[PDB]
Paper text:
Ribosomes are the molecular machines that all cells depend on for protein synthesis. However, ribosomal subunits are exported to the cytoplasm in a functionally inactive and immature state, requiring the further addition of ribosomal proteins and the removal of transacting factors that block ligand binding sites.
To capture a series of particles downstream of the ECL particle, we partially arrested ribosome biogenesis in vivo with diazaborine, an inhibitor of the AAA-ATPase activity of Drg1. The ZBD of Yvh1 is wedged between the P stalk and Tif6 and centered on the sarcin-ricin loop (SRL), an RNA element that is essential for activating translational GTPases. Notably, in the PL particle, the P stalk has undergone a rotation of ~20° away from the central protuberance toward Tif6.
Numbering used by the authors:
A (entry chain V): 312 to 402
B (entry chain g): 2 to 160
C (entry chain G): 7 to 288
D (entry chain M): 6 to 173
RNA sequence: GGUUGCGGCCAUAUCUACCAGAAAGCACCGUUUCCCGUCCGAUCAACUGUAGUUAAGCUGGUAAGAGCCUGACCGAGUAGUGUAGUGGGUGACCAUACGCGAAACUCAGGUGCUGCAAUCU
RNA sequence: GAGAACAGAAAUCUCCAGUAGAACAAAAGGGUAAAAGCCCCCUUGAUUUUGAUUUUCAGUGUGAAUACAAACCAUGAAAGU
RNA sequence: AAGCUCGUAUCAGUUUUAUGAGGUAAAGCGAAUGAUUAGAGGUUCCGGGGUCGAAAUGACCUUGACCUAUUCUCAAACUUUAAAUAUGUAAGAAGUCCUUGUUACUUAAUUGAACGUGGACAUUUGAAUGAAGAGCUUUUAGUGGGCCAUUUUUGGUAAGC
């Protein structure tokens, strides 16, 4: 839980699939630390479908800079690993 | 778990002093160390670079190497059944001269002075030192001096 | 209203520090010698500016005390023709020329290493003569002066470099250094050396505000020295320094002991213990 | 004695304690700019209290200092607002005096409804010549006790000029 | 003997309260064109030694002051401690023999000393 | 501690006192005041080549560390680091 | 155990003269630092650890954030001063002094540094006592379960623990 990174959501694009949590809203999200002076925007499907709106602070795992050392993570297909996993909405 | 770090058990030995904190005075740097001089080691707490280990606090060595900021000192340390000859590189704040050697160098000049002076007279060089002798017989004076009588005191509490 | 415990535990700082004169973090880096030299003293050009006076010295280090090798002051310049303005930028250049030609005379490196003489205000430092003795190397000591470009301090440095002393320095704190391009203006630097920045201001204040031209610059009007002749003052002055930087002292009066016979009268003396005990008794 | 032991009005420190940052802070800055004639500097918060609504490093307040002859003229215009009348307070034990007003449209230039209404704090320091020795770099020292300013000396000075009252 | 520049040793030099200082040196002080730096020529920059001052800084003195530093048939040869005994004591611990031996306190005295270069009734 | 509109226990501003009672990524112990803390300006020496030396020690390893030499640079007006 | 080079060599579980280092016993709390046993309130002056939420003006539970008033204690993990016993080095010939040789280091400089030529200082040659010789080397056996006593102590009620 100590690896969570603050994210700021730009908008929510839902695909209309919903099991019990409004499945697969393609959230366009940007980093809290890079929103100020950068132009860098990430693009990710997530289960946080209905509870998320524009300008909300969410927490997330950030795979793009993390060098894990698991043999299970090493035995994957890297180009199928997402850059962002949205974990929970803050406040 | 045990603790055997590089500065363990040095709480009171690397403290600076009482009312002597702050920067060092400039006659520490201006002194001159030539190869072969007898030096003493006392680790300064404020200057962390080039610092002697906690063993060599208080030992005494000989300077063999002189470099920019530091001096090279040899120390005889015992281990097991044998002396070894270990070498250090101490910055000049931690080092200081030994006055026992400095009194030796001026006693040689006095010993050379007495031999050359006694040769002009011709006898009795008399140059070795002698320890404390038992004293000679002498006569004390009771003139204006009566021997005062003492006695043991009784017991009182006054507590 | 200070407790007895407060004065009990009190690191009293060093004597030159609570008086506020000497930085000791700077002094350690200036004094120390590479220990493989064993004796070689590190000579420090000490340039200190008071108001209305300029002090320049060449000193070394010893545990008993610092040893002065040679020194000159701003008030020796009326011997060399400079009367008024003996604390400006230009007189600071003349004093650094005076210590250099003096310390090369008493040392022996006088005939060689003449330095520049046709001075144009261009950054260069002295070069070692082929198959000869090396020039005398003196480092700069500034004390507590804030280092800003165009200062009076580096003018005393420029007189030292032109006199022949080896002083390591850059060209960026001289006046006329440009911020955008990293070059020096040699024409504008040559103005400051001969008092151009003062003689320019004698022009603008003349026609516009006559009221202050009597109050300021009054020594100029008394000797009738106009603005354009100010550049001719220092030009004759630098050649006067090359002739005889011999430092003859003065007579001061009859002797020294007449000075001590005066100053005893005005200082108070300590009372004795029994005279103190008589005052406690009353 | 008299001859150089004289009071003076060393600096005047205008202050506007804006509650929360924003464009309302920058509209307060243009008030001090047209008043003092200089560019004001802005101060940041030290801590986050959250009962006032502030956060750390927010550029919460502005202030500008005025020295020289221009400080006396702004001081005269401020005292006319309160009719040369101050309380038994407003004079510190060090000898300095200050007072705060509100609704700056009552003095000065104009109303100008785009910029709004603001209240200022005026604070005046007092010293004598020779106070350089505490501010300078080389040979720093402290001023002796008989040359220091007191509360009693300022009120004796402030009654003499401007014909004012400490009535409380 | 007094100042100033540069120190050495770093409170016998500091701290608090009042007083005195000729000469010169310092210091306050006057101005903002230029190099330069600030919200503010206050600090630093430059400019004049000019309009003026010992009011401050600085130096010297005084205080049965606070602090600090030396001593002493001061406390005390006491506290502790190294060796020895088929010594005492149910013990706890304590005496002796050959030895080393403090600290707080008490009183008495002290309140910077000096190196280099220059300049001063 | 004493002062300033709204403003109080706590906003911002000012002075006096202030031997570190603060701060220095973290455990505790050292250390530090014109700094080793706070705020600015410039930079990559957190680099290349291999030896000597300290600590645990069998005077082997491993980790960490000190002082140099030969190169190349950073910074500063400079000593230097 | 086999020996080898040498035989007054300078070494020594010691003292003295000189000079270092240390923070335990004792002292101190009217010199800094200082616990303990308990613990009542103040609802966005915080939430820290949760939990449920189609969300946040969002709920519920809890340690509380807060000690908001004073009150004693002394000290292995508190300190200005500081023992005793134990501990490091020096007491010369591989030394001191004149004198001038060496160099690519160093100095403004034949200044320093380092190593030397030639000359001078010997039986008291630089404190005491002792020295069944001093010094170096090769090679291999056994052992790697310990225990007791005075003193200093840690855990423990205490123990032939």
């Amino acid at each position: 839980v100590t690896q969570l990174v603050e994210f700021i959501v730009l908008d929510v694009d839902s695909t209309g699939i919903s099991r019990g949590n409004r499945v697969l809203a393609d959230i366009t999200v940007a980093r809290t630390s890079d929103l100020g002076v950068n132009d860098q925007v990430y693009y990710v499907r997530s289960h946080l479908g209905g509870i998320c709106h524009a300008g909300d602070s969410v927490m997330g795992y950030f795979i793009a800079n993390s060098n894990y050392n698991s043999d299970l993570f090493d035995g994957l297909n890297i180009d199928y690993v997402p850059d962002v996993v949205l974990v929970k909405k803050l406040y | 778990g045990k603790s055997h770090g590089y500065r363990s058990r040095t709480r009171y030995m690397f403290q600076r002093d009482f009312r002597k904190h702050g920067a060092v005075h400039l006659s520490t740097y201006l002194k001159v160390y030539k190869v072969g001089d007898i030096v003493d080691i006392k680790a300064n707490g404020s200057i962390q670079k080039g610092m002697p280990h906690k063993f060599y606090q208080g030992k005494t060595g000989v300077v063999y190497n002189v470099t920019k900021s530091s001096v090279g000192v040899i120390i005889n340390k015992m281990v097991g059944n044998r002396y070894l000859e270990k070498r250090l590189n101490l910055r000049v704040e931690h080092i200081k001269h030994s006055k026992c050697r400095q009194e030796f160098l001026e006693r040689v000049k006095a010993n050379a002075a007495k031999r050359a002076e006694a040769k002009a007279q011709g006898v009795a060089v008399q140059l070795k030192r002698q320890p404390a002798q038992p004293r000679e017989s002498r006569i004390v004076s009771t003139e204006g001096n009566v021997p005062q009588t003492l006695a043991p005191v009784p017991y009182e509490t006054f507590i | 209203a200070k407790s007895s415990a407060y004065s009990s535990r009190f690191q009293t700082p060093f004597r030159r520090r609570r008086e506020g004169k000497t930085d000791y973090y700077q002094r350690k880096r200036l004094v120390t010698q590479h220990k493989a030299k064993y004796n070689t003293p590190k000579y420090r050009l000490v340039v200190r500016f008071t108001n209305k006076d300029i002090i320049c010295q060449i000193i070394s280090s010893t545990i008993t005390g610092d040893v002065v090798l040679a020194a000159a002051y701003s008030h020796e310049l009326p011997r060399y023709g400079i009367t008024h303005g003996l604390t400006n930028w230009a007189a600071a250049y003349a004093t650094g020329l005076l210590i250099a030609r003096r310390t090369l005379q008493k040392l022996g490196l006088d005939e060689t290493y003449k330095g520049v003489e046709e001075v144009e205000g261009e950054y260069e430092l002295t070069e070692a003569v082929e198959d000869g003795p090396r020039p005398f190397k003196v480092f700069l000591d500034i004390g507590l002066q804030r280092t800003t470009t165009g200062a009076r301090v580096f003018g005393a440095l420029k007189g030292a470099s032109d006199g022949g002393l080896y002083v390591p320095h850059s060209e960026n704190r001289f006046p006329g250094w440009d911020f955008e391009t990293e070059e020096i203006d040699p024409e504008l630097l040559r103005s400051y050396i001969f008092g151009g920045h003062v003689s320019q201001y004698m022009e603008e204040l003349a026609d516009d505000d006559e009221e202050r031209f009597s109050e300021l610059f009054k020594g100029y009007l008394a000797d009738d020295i106009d603005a354009d002749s100010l550049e001719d003052i220092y030009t004759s002055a630098h050649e006067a320094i090359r002739a005889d930087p011999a430092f003859k002292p003065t007579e001061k009066k009859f002797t020294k002991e007449q000075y001590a016979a005066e100053s005893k009268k005005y200082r108070q003396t300590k009372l004795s213990k029994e005279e103190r005990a008589a005052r406690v008794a009353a | 004695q008299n001859p150089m032991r004289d009071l003076k009005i060393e600096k005047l420190v205008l202050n506007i304690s804006v509650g929360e940052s924003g464009d309302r802070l920058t509209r307060a800055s243009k008030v001090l700019e047209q008043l003092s004639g200089q560019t004001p500097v802005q101060s940041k918060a030290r801590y986050t209290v959250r009962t006032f609504g502030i956060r750390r490093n927010e550029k919460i307040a502005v202030h500008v200092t005025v020295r020289g002859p221009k400080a006396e003229e702004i001081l005269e215009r401020g005292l006319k607002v309160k009719e040369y009348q101050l309380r038994d307070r407003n004079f510190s034990a060090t000898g300095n005096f200050g007072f705060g007003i509100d609704e700056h449209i009552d003095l000065g230039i104009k109303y100008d409804p785009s910029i709004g209404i603001f209240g200022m704090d005026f604070y005046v320091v007092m010293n004598r010549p020779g106070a350089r020795v505490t501010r300078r770099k080389r040979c720093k020292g402290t001023v002796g006790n008989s040359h220091k300013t007191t509360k009693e000396d300022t009120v004796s000075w402030f009654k003499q000029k401007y014909d004012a009252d400490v009535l409380d």
